[PDB]
């Protein structure tokens, strides 16, 4: 078209990228700058129809979920599928203890305050440009 | 040293102190709201 | 040499360049500016695709949406401005038992107070304090969007916890006991902030629960209604300002058998005597002029014989519903001895007139008469405010009449009535409107008189330590009296950073981060709580402007009492001297601070920034104060009130046309006609106004015709026509209530932007006239740099 | 030797005695200023 007014921005994915950046800063992430940049480009790809935009978001949701799982240090799906039966057969006390040790309240508080700050910013300061700039900076640093 | 002990108990817990402060605010607001309703009803009669 | 240009450059581009050069030469723009503009244009069109229709469509409405950029006025560093604005936009977003209940209340209260004490007195590391800040601020923000009184109480308690934390931190770990110079001034600032905290706490208590008293219906029988006497004391006001008051009084919806209107004249003027004789109202002109207005009212009471006495100022016109909306409670409470009504000002106040915000910002006094008196109503501390009030004469005779000691006689007589056991009441609906002060000097003077009287009452009657009087009443009165002792703390606040910047003196011995993490929550929570409580009464950050205007003139007289028609625009130099002096001191401080940011110790990098931002806030406040001190043009004899009413106009040939009244004054009206039916600039016109279902006719002469808008001038009216006109324009019991209800709410960020613009406007105002010539150059330089920065935001 | 004992007391207690000394200095300065103004006016 003449305008190509389809660069609406990352919208809710700004919080996703901010969470990834914060986790990487904390040191718990195996970050993939190339995959993150490709995913951001996919999210920012202009589409004429709004139906195609919605379909792209729906398709990118599980892709983003899988990318977030991959970029972490959690074990892969093979271990989960092999140990699901053992976890089901384990006692409730061990599962409760594992859940308690898995959850960090400091992490939850940091994520919540980051979400509130993201809400405030997205109300006053847009975040797509900052996210793209940070991703480009990380890619340049890693490649160089 | 009891105040030192209490401070050291919550030395680095901002979330818990925020929760406690909100609880205190809500309860004191309720008590004041009740008292002021009573005084307002007595005042307009 | 045009052949070479034609050969080297394609003729369209050559013609474009020649035309642009000629246009900029005709407008006086430099040729080098045109060359740079063309260079930027070509380098952009080759390095930036301006052929994209998206940007063309944006440019189509760019002028309307962004009129601050001119394509025909090049300036140095334009591309930097374009990039900065683009970056801003891309960044920016486009029941039970008694004992059990008392024990339950005790345990709940003690648990809550213990938790509050823990919250106040918990030392932190900066990250923990910041998290606490964000969490409590978010709680306040959430509770803000919840209408009602419970949310107001929650915000009050949260603000009190934050402020107590701040004061605890200041008194524990900010006082530096190392130097004899970093001690006296630091303690002075600490005492100023403690006074401010006490004033804030007492104000929160005062308006913790507005009573929202409602009128009590009067008995259906008209023989049980009481006799009321209206007093209008005048000393030197012209008859043109008391005529409307008397006409509105003559039209009050009260039985004329039980309504006597008195005109009290301390000047012995014969015009007022003849006016009273003509209109049929009473007249008293006492031979001895002692005790001023209080003595006049006492002498009037010596002759008047009525159950109730209602005191009206000369400029205050009552609505016809005043007595019906007021007298209900006097027949319900036998102990009542005083009722108060809000003071409304249809005339523009000096702030509203000079600063250009009349119907946008609320009045200075609508916080008091809208919230503070309603709060005092609950604690039975609603004091007499001079006018728009009714006093039962039986209690007033016991106390010996209006008190004659202090210059604020109304507050004194109300205090005496409260000390004799009688109560008071307040009614929120504005039923009388008056004239505001015509200049800043008048406002300063009347505030000075009020403050002197209040300090005199504090020193003489001493509500804290007297006779029978409830504790809440004591607190309310002492808060009203302490409100006028805030000049010294304001001066300290305006002159505090200059201490450190000029003479090295650590007032607050803490890192700038901790100061920002402790002082800021106090201010934020106070602002939010007030914005919720005094929502449609006072916009944020405006109270400081009034305080700084009054401070230098109220501090001396209050301290002493504690011990014992604008033809041309102009700047009141005499009034504005303190503001200019404080501006000079603060800016010499900022020059010293700019020096210190480089040639001072590097460790004092954030501290200098904190002091500089304090100085900048001081300068904005003082600039607003100066902006108040320039008087706008005023050539209107009578002030106009913007009110929309349907009407009709009658010509001498018998044709009638509809019109919409848009404003009215004492001697004229302004109407709008859809199509300018038939009217010329000298023709007589009969104006048809409806009060309910009744139509009234008033002779008028056309003064101005400017298309749809027509200005009318009232013909000499008879007494009955005057009464009807007042009842149809001024004394309508809908204008003032809807006026107050149409005030916009409080938006702190928009208020900050408005105050910044006001300070800039005041600086530009002083960039034209200068008492001391030398200041001229400095002011011009400041304005120049300021507008350059504004153009480069 | 009132200055010697005053300095010794200030060294002993730097919190309450410092405030008391500051208040006394302020009061003495005010009294001396008033006396000097009265003398000059005569
Ligand atoms: N001959 C004549 N023309 C009148 C009269 N009232 C209004 N106009 C005309 O109508 C325009 C709009 O004035 P506004 O709506 O009252 O809005 C006015 C008003 O808010 C203010 N203003 C101007 N002069 C005065 C003044 O002497 N006193 C006050 N209080 N405001 C004034 O400035 C605005 C713009 O006024 P202008 O630029 O003069 O432009 C005025 C003027 O051309 C009037 O009584 N006589
Ligand atoms: N409500 C209302 N009343 C109107 C209007 N036009 C005229 N009047 C009435 O007619 C009187 C004479 O106004 P004028 O002959 O235009 O003579 C005016 C005019 O020359 C000047 N003036 C007053 N206000 C303005 C204003 O806002 N702008 C300008 N440009 N001149 C004004 O001062 C003279 C005295 O005016 P006032 O003292 O106000 O007295 C005014 C006022 O009572 C109008 O649009 N609305």
Automatic annotation (TrEMBL), chain B:
Domain of life of the native organism: Bacteria
Localization annotation: Cell inner membrane
Coiled-coil region: none
Regions crossing the membrane: 15-36
Its biological purpose: Binds the cellulose synthase activator, bis-(3'-5') cyclic diguanylic acid (c-di-GMP).
Assembly information from the UniProt record: Tightly associated with the cellulose synthase catalytic subunit.
Sequence similarity: Belongs to the AcsB/BcsB family.
Name of protein: Cyclic di-GMP-binding protein
Native source organism of the sequence: Escherichia coli
From TrEMBL, chain D:
Localization per Swiss-Prot or TrEMBL: Cell inner membrane
Assembly and interaction partners: Tightly associated with the cellulose synthase catalytic subunit.
Protein name (Swiss-Prot/TrEMBL): Cyclic di-GMP-binding protein
Function noted in UniProt: Binds the cellulose synthase activator, bis-(3'-5') cyclic diguanylic acid (c-di-GMP).
Location of this fragment in the whole protein: 731 to 772 of 779
Record gene name: bcsB
TM region(s), chain numbering: 15-36
Taxonomic superkingdom: Bacteria
Recorded family membership: Belongs to the AcsB/BcsB family.
């Amino acid at each position: 078209s003449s305008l190509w007014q389809y660069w609406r921005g990352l919208s809710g994915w700004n919080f996703y990228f901010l969470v990834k950046f914060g986790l990487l800063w904390a040191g718990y992430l195996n970050f993939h700058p190339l995959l993150n940049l490709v995913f951001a480009a996919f999210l920012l790809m202009p589409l004429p129809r709004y139906s195609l935009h919605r379909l792209r978001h729906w398709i990118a949701l599980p892709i983003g979920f899988a990318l977030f799982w991959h970029d972490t240090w959690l074990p892969g799906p093979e271990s989960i599928m092999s140990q699901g039966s053992q976890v089901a057969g384990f006692s409730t006390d061990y599962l409760i203890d594992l859940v308690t040790r898995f959850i960090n309240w400091q992490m939850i508080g940091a994520i919540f305050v980051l979400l509130v700050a993201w809400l405030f910013l997205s109300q006053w300061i847009r975040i797509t440009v900052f996210v793209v700039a940070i991703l480009l900076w990380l890619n340049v640093l890693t490649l160089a | 040293p009891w105040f030192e002990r209490l401070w050291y108990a919550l030395a680095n817990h901002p979330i818990l102190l925020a929760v406690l402060a909100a609880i205190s605010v809500i309860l004191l607001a309720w008590v004041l709201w009740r008292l002021l309703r009573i005084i307002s009803r007595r005042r307009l009669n | 040499m045009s052949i070479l240009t034609r050969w080297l450059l394609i003729p369209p581009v050559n013609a474009r360049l020649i035309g642009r050069y000629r246009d900029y030469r005709r407008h006086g723009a430099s040729a080098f500016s045109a060359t740079l503009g063309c260079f930027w244009m070509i380098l952009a069109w080759i390095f930036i695709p301006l052929e994209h229709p998206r940007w063309q469509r944006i440019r189509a409405e760019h002028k309307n949406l962004y009129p601050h950029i001119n394509a025909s006025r090049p300036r140095p560093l334009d591309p930097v401005r374009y990039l900065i604005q683009t970056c801003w936009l891309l960044i920016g977003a486009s029941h039970l038992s008694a004992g059990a209940r008392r024990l339950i209340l005790g345990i709940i209260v003690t648990f809550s107070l213990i938790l509050a004490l823990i919250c106040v007195t918990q030392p932190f590391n900066p990250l923990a304090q910041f998290i606490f800040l964000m969490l409590l601020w978010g709680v306040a923000l959430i509770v803000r969007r919840m209408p009602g009184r419970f949310s107001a109480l929650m915000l009050i308690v949260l603000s009190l916890t934050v402020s107590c934390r701040y004061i605890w931190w200041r008194y524990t770990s900010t006082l530096n006991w190392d130097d004899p110079v970093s001690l006296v001034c630091g303690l002075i600032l600490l005492f100023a902030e403690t006074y401010a905290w006490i004033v804030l706490v007492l104000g929160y208590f005062q308006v913790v629960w507005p009573l929202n008293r409602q009128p009590v219906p009067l008995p259906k029988d008209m023989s049980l209604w009481p006799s009321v006497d209206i007093f209008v004391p005048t000393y030197n006001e012209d008859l043109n300002v008391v005529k409307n008051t008397i006409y509105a009084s003559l039209g009050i919806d009260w039985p004329k058998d039980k309504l006597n209107i008195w005109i009290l004249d301390d000047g012995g003027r014969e015009e007022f005597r003849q006016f009273a004789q003509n209109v049929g109202v009473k007249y008293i002109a006492r031979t001895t002029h002692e005790h001023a207005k209080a003595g006049n009212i006492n002498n009037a009471l010596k002759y008047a014989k009525g159950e109730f006495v209602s005191i009206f100022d000369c400029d205050h016109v009552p609505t016809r519903s005043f007595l019906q909306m007021t007298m209900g409670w006097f027949l319900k409470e036998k102990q009542l001895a005083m009722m108060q009504t809000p003071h409304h000002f249809f005339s523009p106040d000096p702030f509203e007139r000079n600063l250009g915000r009349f119907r946008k910002t609320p009045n200075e006094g609508t916080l008091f008469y809208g919230l503070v008196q309603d709060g005092n109503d609950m604690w039975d501390a609603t004091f007499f405010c001079g006018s728009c009030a009714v006093i039962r004469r039986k209690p007033l005779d016991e106390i010996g009449g209006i008190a004659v000691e202090t210059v604020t006689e109304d507050a004194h007589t109300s205090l005496r009535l409260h000390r004799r056991g009688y109560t008071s009441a307040y009614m929120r609906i504005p039923q009388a409107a008056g004239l505001a002060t015509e200049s800043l000097s008048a406002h300063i003077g009347q505030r000075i008189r009020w403050a002197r009287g209040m300090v005199q009452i504090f020193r003489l009657d001493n509500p804290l330590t007297g006779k029978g009087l409830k504790f809440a009443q004591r607190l309310c009165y002492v808060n009203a009296m302490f409100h006028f002792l805030s000049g010294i703390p304001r001066l300290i606040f305006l002159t505090a950073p200059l201490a450190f910047l000029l003479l090295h003196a650590y007032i607050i011995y803490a890192p700038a981060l901790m100061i920002a993490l402790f002082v800021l929550p106090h201010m934020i929570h106070a602002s939010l709580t007030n914005s919720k409580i005094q929502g449609k009464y006072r916009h944020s950050f405006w109270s400081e402007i009034y305080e700084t205007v009054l401070a230098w003139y109220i501090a001396p007289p209050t301290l002493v009492a504690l011990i014992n028609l604008v033809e041309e625009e102009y700047v009141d130099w005499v009034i504005s001297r303190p503001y200019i002096f404080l501006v000079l001191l603060n800016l010499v401080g900022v020059a010293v601070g700019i020096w210190r940011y480089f040639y001072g110790p590097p460790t004092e990098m954030l501290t200098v920034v904190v002091s500089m931002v304090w100085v900048f806030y001081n300068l904005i406040v003082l600039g607003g104060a100066v902006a108040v001190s320039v008087e706008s043009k005023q050539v209107r004899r009578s002030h106009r009130v913007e009110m929309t009413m349907p009407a009709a106009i009658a010509r001498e040939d018998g044709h009638l046309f509809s019109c919409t009244v848009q404003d009215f004054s004492d001697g004229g009206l302004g109407i709008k006609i859809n199509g300018q039916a038939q009217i010329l600039e000298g023709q007589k016109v009969n104006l048809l106004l409806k009060r309910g279902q009744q139509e009234y006719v008033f002779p008028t002469q056309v003064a101005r015709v400017m298309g749809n808008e027509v200005g009318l001038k009232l013909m000499p009216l008879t007494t009955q026509q005057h009464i009807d006109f007042v009842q149809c324009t001024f004394a309508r019991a809908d204008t003032w209530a809807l006026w107050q209800d149409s005030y916009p709410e409080d938006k702190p960020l928009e208020s900050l932007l408005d105050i910044l613009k006001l300070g800039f406007r005041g600086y530009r105002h002083l960039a034209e006239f200068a008492p001391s010539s030398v200041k001229g150059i400095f002011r011009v330089l400041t304005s120049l740099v300021s507008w350059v920065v504004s153009f480069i935001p």
